[PDB]
């Protein structure tokens, strides 16, 4: 069918690499979610033989995601602090994956418009994605602050308190302190809105790795890119409902392990030596 002719020519990892090279694509928006960091060993909330899941049980939540609710934090901070102790998201424990290093390579090639991550693990930053190019749209465990007055709090103090069973408290208002993770009901950082209003409308290509589409406003990012640009989804699930059609035919879904798919993409891009070298240098 003519209406199915794909913007990429061949909707394959090979075709994508060709399209990037032949069209000299320089404005690649990369979006990153929880699927990208599984290979780093990050504890899945939802997995029954995890320590993280065992914990959530006693509390009985209509969702592991209520642990990240600002209203539950004000009411019963022991719950999020108990989860924080188990996830080990403090920078310097987990290491970047092949996806993370790949994004760094796109930056060093001059092809990254912006990397926007909904992960709170800091691995994009650990892979050397620069500050001007990285948006931690949901924050991370790198800094901490009072939720009532927003006064910064020592992350090292917050770490020591959290890991020894103490909920941290503001020295100005007695408010509850947390790491600067954006919780449900909090504002996202400015840099997210910069990316949504200014980067996504000028993307030439969007590669969406391991993300849900069910957390907002983050999920708007690929909705506001031009209607004609390719959107590459690497995910273990058929995500996005009817917002994606896997108006020109421009979406593709690559199932399987996103770590393997990025490695293959890298091969076709001529970046396989640079990637193997980053991967040895820190695994």
């Amino acid at each position: 069918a003519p209406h199915q002719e794909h913007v990429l020519g061949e909707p394959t990892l090979e075709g994508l690499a060709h399209y990037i090279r032949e069209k000299n694509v320089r404005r690649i928006l990369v979006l990153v979610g929880a699927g990208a960091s599984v290979a780093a060993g990050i504890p899945d909330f939802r997995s029954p033989d995890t320590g993280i899941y065992a914990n959530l049980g006693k509390y009985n939540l209509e969702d592991p995601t209520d642990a990240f609710s600002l209203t539950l934090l004000r009411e019963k901070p022991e719950i999020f602090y108990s989860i924080a102790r188990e996830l080990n998201l403090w920078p310097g424990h987990f290491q970047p994956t092949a996806v993370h290093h790949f994004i760094r390579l796109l930056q060093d090639e001059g092809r990254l418009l912006r990397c926007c991550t909904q992960n709170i693990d800091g691995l994009e930053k650990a892979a050397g994605v620069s500050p001007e190019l990285l948006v931690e749209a949901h924050g991370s465990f790198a800094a901490a602050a009072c939720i009532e007055c927003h006064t910064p709090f020592s992350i090292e103090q917050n770490y020591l308190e959290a890991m020894s069973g103490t909920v941290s408290r503001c020295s100005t208002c007695g408010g509850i302190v947390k790491p600067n993770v954006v919780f449900f009901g909090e504002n996202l950082p400015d840099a997210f809105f910069d990316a949504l209003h200014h980067d996504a409308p000028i993307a030439e290509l969007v590669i969406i790795i391991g993300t849900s589409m069910q957390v907002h406003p983050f999920a708007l990012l690929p909705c506001v890119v031009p209607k004609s640009v390719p959107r590459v989804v690497m995910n273990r699930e058929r995500v996005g409902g009817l917002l994606f059609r896997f108006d020109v035919c421009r979406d593709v879904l690559f199932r399987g392990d996103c770590q393997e798919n990025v490695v293959t993409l890298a091969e076709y891009l001529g970046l396989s030596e640079a990637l193997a070298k980053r991967m040895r240098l820190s695994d």
């Binding site: 009901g185 957390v215 907002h216």
Partner: peptide
Amino acid sequence: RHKKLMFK
């Protein structure tokens, strides 16, 4: 601009 949310 709006806050972090999900449809439950």
